[PDB]
Amino acid sequence: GNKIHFINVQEGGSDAIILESNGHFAMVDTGEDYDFPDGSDSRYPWREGIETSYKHVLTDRVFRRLKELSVQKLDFILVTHTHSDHIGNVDELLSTYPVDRVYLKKYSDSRITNSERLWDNLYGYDKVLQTATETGVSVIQNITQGDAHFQFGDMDIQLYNYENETDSSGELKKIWDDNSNSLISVVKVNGKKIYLGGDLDNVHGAEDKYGPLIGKVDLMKFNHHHDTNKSNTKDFIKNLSPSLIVQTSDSLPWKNGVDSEYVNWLKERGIERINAASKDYDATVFDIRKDGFVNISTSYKPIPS
Ligand SMILES: C[N+](C)(C)CCOP(=O)(O)O
Ligand SMILES: [Ca+2]
Ligand SMILES: [Ca+2]
Ligand SMILES: [Fe+3]
Ligand SMILES: [Fe+3]
Numbered sequence: 067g068n069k070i071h072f073i074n075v076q077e078g079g080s081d082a083i084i085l086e087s088n089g090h091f092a093m094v095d096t097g098e099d100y101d102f103p104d105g106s107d108s109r110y111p112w113r114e115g116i117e118t119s120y121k122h123v124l125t126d127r128v129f130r131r132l133k134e135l136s137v138q139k140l141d142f143i144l145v146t147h148t149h150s151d152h153i154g155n156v157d158e159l160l161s162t163y164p165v166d167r168v169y170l171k172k173y174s175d176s177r178i179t180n181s182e183r184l185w186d187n188l189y190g191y192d193k194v195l196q197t198a199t200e201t202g203v204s205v206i207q208n209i210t211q212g213d214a215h216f217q218f219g220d221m222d223i224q225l226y227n228y229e230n231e232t233d234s235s236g237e238l239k240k241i242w243d244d245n246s247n248s249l250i251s252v253v254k255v256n257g258k259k260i261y262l263g264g265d266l267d268n269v270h271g272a273e274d275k276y277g278p279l280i281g282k283v284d285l286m287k288f289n290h291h292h293d294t295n296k297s298n299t300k301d302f303i304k305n306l307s308p309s310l311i312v313q314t315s316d317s318l319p320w321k322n323g324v325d326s327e328y329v330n331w332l333k334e335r336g337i338e339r340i341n342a343a344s345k346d347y348d349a350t351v352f353d354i355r356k357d358g359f360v361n362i363s364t365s366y367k368p369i370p371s
Pocket of ligand 1: 079115116117149150151185186245265290291
């Protein structure tokens, strides 16, 4: 305690984050996995853009880091949303580690208004529910007020955008993409604050709404890897006013190519920005101290090699 490990991608964008406090371990998201549905089960039909590439898989880096840390137990796994590059390794983790619970908001294909954004989502969701039932791992889907503040080693954690919002009948409210449903975590320890918002976007107003409620932080994980079209809205960055942005991506901020204007804007504001992308190390690690964040990535063994 107290450290945050952002598992590095080889290529593309994917989130797996390990929180380490005192001697406790937890995960915020789990990264993309080898498995995917092929359409042999019509519940999970093939659809175009389901991820298949081993170059985008984080499975081996996640499991190697956990083993290198002598993890015996995860106190929780928090899942931000159902996309495979976030929920992907949950059932593999549930099958390997003791886990005391999982935070997983409700999902249904029916609540996504675009058929071309269903992909893999349900397969991943249903892997969590089925595997957690087989292992007796408690799944918190109806997160009370609640529930949404709580204590993890030395870390104080506050959740946002955690409710299952319903229509009448209710039925989950319709959204354009599961990104807008992203479960947000703010972690506070040693006088520092870290925002972790999955693939939060502003398509249904979530950045406009939660920016002012979250307020000032020190370290911000970029929303949705690198996108500046529908995420990482300037009002949202100014609300959080982070000293450091970490991207779980090998790409610079991106809107029809490198958003050089946006990259320049961050430098002008004095915001440092780093990519958690590597061929040499499993994670970009910060030590979270009273004095600031120290990048201790090179203090771990490299990937063999
Ligand atoms: C689910 N997916 C991996 C096929 C699409 C990409 O997800 P996103 O990171 O752009 O929301
Ligand atoms: Ca997968
Ligand atoms: Ca899996
Ligand atoms: Fe993603
Ligand atoms: Fe996503």
